[PDB]
Design a protein around this ligand. Structure first.
Ligand SMILES: *[C@@H]1O[C@H](CO)[C@@H](O)[C@H](O)[C@H]1O
Ligand SMILES: *[C@@H]1O[C@H](CO)[C@@H](O)[C@H](O)[C@H]1O
Ligand SMILES: [Ca+2]
Ligand SMILES: [Ca+2]
Ligand SMILES: [Mg+2]
Ligand SMILES: [Mg+2]
Lengths: 568, 565
C-alpha cells in the first residue's frame, strides 16, 4: 500500500454548518447559545467533523436572525459573550476542530453605527451605503418615485425613504439590512478590518454570504439614474413581488468578483504573515454555473474563494430526480470547476428544506454517502447526520422575516425557512434535549421521539452510525487521494467508485428511485467480487460485513451500499 | 473487435431532395438528380442516406403535408425513379431510409376527404371536436380548447363540410391522425410494409412528440386547455402562449413507437438480409427523448432517437466547458447498449457554420466523426455551407408566412438552411442548369462549393473524407472515450483502445488564442502526428506535435494520431 502525503485540511474537510439558535440551549431560554455549542463540541469529534461554521453570532437586532448585523466586532447577547466565543475557539482547537465564522459583507443592520453615522451624513460614513434621490417625476411633481423598480429579496421595493436624510437607501434584503457601497474603498477596508479582527481572535476562516448582491449598476453608466431591472413579464407578479424583475443591474455584476479576489489577496497575505494552518474563505452565492465558477478565480489568473459552495443538491436535484439526473448534476461541478479547484457538496442549509424533505426519508443514507464519497469537501447542515426532517411551523409560530414579508396564512409555507431551523434533536427528553424548557424559539418537530441522536447512538443501525462510518472512511487514502468514476447503471441506480492502485476500492451503489432495480456489478469499474458491505442504508437487506458474491444485485427503492473491494 | 451491425456506427446523411440536385432544369431537386450524385456518398464516406419526404404532397410544408403515402411527388419523379434510386444506392453499398410523418396527413389526402364526409371506417381517422359557445359574442364559435399550432394560431380548424373542428398541431393543411384509432395504427403498418417491400432500409419518423393529445373521455367529454405560460410577450394566437401539457410528450405516444419496432423486428426476422431500422425525430427534454429508445419495463423503441443537442444547447455563445457538459448529456442519459448519435443540422434549423462560426466547421465535423456511435450529416455540412439569404419576397416556408412578416419572418423561416446544394461555380452552383431555383442560391457559392474543395489541397470536404475514413479504425468503432475542458476555450476528446492507435481531438471553440498543457490530456504521448487540422491551422496533416505546450488559434481543431495505450 503506497505512502500518500496528507492534503491541506480545507481540501477534504468534513465541514458542518451549525445554526446556533437551534443547536443547543444551555440556559432554558429556548434559544441555542455558545455555552450550548461548547458543551457539545465533543459531538463533532464523535461525528468525524473536521470543521464547523456557525450562522452569524455577531450583535444583531435578529430581524433576519443574525444576518442583520449591528456590530461586526462583538457577540449577540442571546448567544453569549466574546469570552464564550474565545472559550469556544480554545476548546474547539484543543479537540483539533477548525472554526469558521459566517458574516454577510453585503449589508449592515440599520442599528449599526455605520448606518446611524451614514444617515446623519457623518464624515467617513455619508457614502458607506447606497443613497439615491427620487426619480424626477415632472408629470406629477408631488408624487415621489423610487430611484428604480428594484425589488427586495424579501418583497417590496429595494429602496427605503429616509425622512432624516431625504434620500432612499438600498436594501436588497429587509428594510433593516442596508446595502454597503462596495465601490467605496473605506467599505472594502472595513471588510479587511472585520476579517483581521476575527482571524486575530483565532478564527480558521470565513463563510461570506449573499455575494451575488454586492454590486449594482453605477448611475454614471445610465445617464445619472439607477437603471430599472428588466421586467420578467410573468403575469403572476406585480411590482412589489419578487419575480417581477430580472436582476440584470442588481446581481452577479462582474465587479463583485474583484472584491472577492481582493479578499483572497488579503487572506493569502495574512497566512504568509501568521503561518500555522491556512485560513480560508468559502463564498455563498446562488447563481448560474458560469457566475458560480468565477468565485474560484478567472482564466486571467485571478484567485478567489478557496471555493464557492455547490448548491446543486438543493437547486437541481430532488425526489423528482432519477439516477441519470444525479450523475449529470454531479458532473456539472466537475466539468465546470477550474483546473486545481477543490470540489464541495452541500445537501442543506438554514435557507432551504431539509435533505430528507427535499428527497425522501428512505434516501438519507445514500445522500450522506454521496456527500462523503465524492472527491473534495463534504458539507453537512445541522441535523443531516441524524436525518432530521422539516418541522411543522404554523403561521402563528412563523418568525422568518421572508415569510412575514412575502406571505400570509395561506401562502407563508412557500417562503418560510423556519421548517429547516427547528431545534436539533439530541434525545427524547423535553424539547428533544435542545432545551430543558417546553418553550423553544421555534417549535420542536413532532418526530423527535422517532428521530434523535441518542436513539441513533443506542440502536444497532442508524443514520448517525452510518455518518460516523463514512467520515471514518474519508481518512482512507482511497477517499482523500483516489480517482473517482460515476455513471448511471439504469434510470434508478448509479455507482460512484473511489479507486487508488494498492489501496482498497470503495463503491457506492444507490437506487434513488421509488422502484426496485437489479444491476450487473460486472459493469462497475474496479469492482472485483467477492466484496464486503462497509455501509448499508438503515433498512438494507445487507448488514455491514455482508459478503457480495453474485454479479446480480437487487436494490430496494432508496437502498444505498458502500462495498469494500480488493485494490486495483 | 466483432463487426457492428451497419446502423451502430454508420455515417448518416440527410438529403433535402428539393435542394440536392435538379436533373430536369425546373429549379426543383428530383430523384434523377440524387441518382446522378449517389457516387458523392461513396466519395464522402457516407454509409446511409435519408431523404426528407418524397411522397405525393401539395407542398404546403414541402413534403411534410402528404396527400398519398404510397406514391412519389411528381416534381421529384416517379415510382420507377425511386426504384432506380434504391437499385443504384444498394449497388454502391449505401442504405436508404424514407422520411414520413405519422402524426398528420394533407387535407388533400383521401383519408381526410373521406373522414370529413363521415365515410364509414374513416369518421374517427382524425381528431374531430364540437365548438364551444362564446360569452363575448354568441354568433362567433370558439374552438374546443386554447391549443396553439406549432406554425401559430389555433390548433383547431373549422370544417364547413363536417360542422366540427379538426386538430392540426402543424399547418391548417396538416390534419392530426387519431392514434387511439386501431384503423389509423393499422394504416401506418400498411405504409411501412409497402416501402420495406420496395427495398427501403428503414424509416425516419417525424413529429412523434405530437402523436397523442388528452382524451376528452378523461376530462368529462371536453378537450382540456393547455396551461398558460403567463409570458406577456405571447398573445393567445402565438406559439409560447401555452405549455403543451395535454398536447405533447404524452406517455401513450411511446406505446405506438414500441409497436412500430415490434412490427420492424418481425419484418427483419421474416425477410432477413441487412437490419431495417427506425430513427425517430422528437424535440423534447432528455428524459422524454430517452423513452424513444425503450423503457426500464423492457419496451424497445427506435434504433435511436436523434440527438439535437448541437442544435438546441450549443452555439457560438458556448465555451469549451459547455461543449463537454452538453456532449456528456446523451452519454449520461442513454440506456445501456444504446447507440449514441450526433446531429449538427437539419432542414428545420440554421446551418451548422451560421449557428456556430465559419472557422469552427472542421472542429464540429471532427466532433461528429470522433464521438462514439453514429455521425449524422445534413446536406451542405461536408462543405461548410452557410445559411443562404432569402428575402420576404422569396420566403416559401409556411412557418415564416404564418408566424412572421417582412420585419420578423427571419426569426421563424427555415428557408436559409434549404437553399440549393453548392456542387460547383456553374449556374445556380451546379444545383440546376436553370436560374429559376425554388429557393435562391446562397451568394457565397463561388467561395463554398464541392468542386472547389475537391481541387484544393486543404478543404472542409477533404477533412470530412479523412474523418469518415478514420471511422474504419477499431479505436473509433470500439474505443473508450475521455472528454474534458482544458480551459473555457479548449477541450479534448480522446478515443483509446489497448494495442490500437490513440486519436485525440483538441478544439479551441473560442474567438481567442489558447495555450494548453498536453500533459493534462490522458493517453496522449508525444511526439504525435497531425491526422486532420482545421483549414486555417498552421499545422498540416503529417506535422509532428513534439512540445507539451500547444497554442491553438480561434476555432482551431487538430486530430492527433498517438501511440496505442
Ligand atoms: C444569506 O443572506 C440572507 C441575507 O443576509 C439571509 O437571509 C440568508 O439566511 C443567508 O444565507
Ligand atoms: C417534422 O414535422 C414538421 C411538420 O410535419 C415539419 O415542418 C418539419 O420540417 C419536420 O422536421
Ligand atoms: Ca449590494
Ligand atoms: Ca397528433
Ligand atoms: Mg439559551
Ligand atoms: Mg427538377
Amino acid at each position: 500500500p503506497t505512502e500518500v502525503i496528507q492534503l491541506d485540511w480545507w481540501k477534504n474537510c468534513v465541514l458542518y454548518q451549525i445554526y446556533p439558535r437551534s443547536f443547543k440551549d444551555s440556559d432554558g431560554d429556548g434559544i441555542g447559545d455558545l455555552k450550548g455549542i461548547i458543551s457539545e463540541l465533543k459531538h463533532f469529534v464523535d461525528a468525524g467533523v473536521d470543521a464547523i461554521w456557525m450562522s452569524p453570532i455577531f450583535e444583531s437586532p435578529m430581524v433576519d436572525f443574525g444576518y442583520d448585523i449591528s456590530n461586526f466586532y462583538d457577540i449577540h447577547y442571546e448567544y453569549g459573550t466574546m469570552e464564550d466565543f474565545e472559550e469556544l475557539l480554545d476548546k474547539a482547537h484543543e479537540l483539533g476542530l477548525k472554526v469558521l465564522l459566517d458574516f454577510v459583507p453585503n449589508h449592515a443592520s440599520n442599528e449599526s453605527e455605520y448606518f446611524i453615522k451614514s444617515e446623519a451624513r457623518e464624515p467617513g460614513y455619508e457614502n458607506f451605503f447606497i443613497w439615491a434621490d427620487p426619480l424626477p417625476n415632472p408629470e406629477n411633481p408631488g408624487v415621489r418615485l423610487p430611484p428604480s423598480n428594484w425589488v427586495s429579496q424579501f418583497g417590496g421595493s429595494a429602496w427605503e425613504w429616509s425622512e432624516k436624510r431625504q434620500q432612499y437607501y438600498l436594501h436588497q434584503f429587509a428594510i433593516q439590512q442596508v446595502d454597503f457601497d462596495f465601490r467605496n474603498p473605506a467599505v472594502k477596508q472595513e471588510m479587511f478590518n472585520i476579517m483581521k479582527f476575527w482571524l486575530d481572535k483565532g478564527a480558521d476562516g470565513f463563510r461570506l454570504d449573499a455575494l451575488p448582491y454586492l454590486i449594482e449598476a453605477d448611475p454614471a453608466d445610465h445617464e445619472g439614474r439607477y437603471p430599472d431591472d428588466p421586467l420578467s413579464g410573468l403575469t403572476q407578479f406585480e411590482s412589489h413581488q419578487l419575480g417581477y424583475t430580472i436582476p440584470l443591474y442588481t446581481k452577479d455584476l462582474i465587479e463583485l468578483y474583484d472584491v472577492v479576489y481582493e479578499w483572497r489577496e488579503f487572506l493569502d497575505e495574512y497566512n504568509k504573515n501568521h503561518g500555522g494552518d491556512t485560513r480560508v474563505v468559502f463564498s455563498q452565492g446562488y447563481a448560474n454555473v458560469s457566475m458560480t465558477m468565477l468565485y474560484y478565480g478567472n482564466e486571467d489568473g485571478a484567485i478567489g474563494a478557496h471555493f464557492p459552495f455547490n448548491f446543486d443538491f438543493i437547486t437541481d436535484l430532488s425526489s423528482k430526480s432519477n439516477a441519470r439526473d444525479f450523475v449529470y448534476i454531479i458532473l456539472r461541478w466537475l466539468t465546470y470547476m477550474p483546473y486545481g479547484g477543490i470540489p464541495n457538496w452541500v445537501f442543506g442549509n438554514h435557507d432551504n428544506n431539509r435533505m430528507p424533505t427535499r428527497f425522501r426519508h428512505d434516501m438519507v443514507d445514500g445522500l450522506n454517502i454521496i456527500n462523503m464519497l465524492l472527491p473534495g469537501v463534504a458539507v453537512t447542515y445541522q441535523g443531516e447526520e441524524i436525518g432530521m426532517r422539516d418541522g411543522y411551523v404554523s403561521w402563528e409560530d412563523t418568525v422568518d422575516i421572508e415569510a412575514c414579508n412575502r406571505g400570509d396564512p395561506d401562502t407563508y409555507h412557500l417562503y418560510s425557512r423556519d421548517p429547516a431551523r427547528t431545534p436539533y434533536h439530541w434525545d427524547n427528553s423535553t424539547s428533544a434535549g435542545f432545551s430543558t424548557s417546553t418553550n423553544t424559539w421555534l417549535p420542536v418537530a413532532e418526530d423527535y421521539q422517532e428521530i434523535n441522536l441518542a436513539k441513533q447512538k443506542e440502536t444497532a443501525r442508524s443514520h448517525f452510525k452510518n455518518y460516523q462510518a463514512l467520515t471514518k472512511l474519508r481518512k482512507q487514502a482511497t477517499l482523500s487521494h483516489g480517482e473517482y468514476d460515476i455513471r448511471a447503471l439504469s434510470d434508478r441506480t448509479f455507482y460512484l467508485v473511489r479507486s487508488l492502485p494498492t489501496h482498497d476500492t470503495y463503491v457506492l451503489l444507490f437506487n434513488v428511485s421509488e422502484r426496485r432495480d437489479t444491476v450487473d456489478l460486472g459493469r462497475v469499474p474496479h469492482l472485483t467480487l467477492p466484496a464486503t458491505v462497509y455501509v448499508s442504508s438503515i433498512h438494507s437487506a445487507r448488514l455491514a460485513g455482508h459478503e457480495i458474491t453474485s454479479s446480480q444485485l437487487s436494490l430496494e427503492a432508496g437502498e444505498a451500499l458502500v462495498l469494500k473491494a480488493q485494490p486495483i
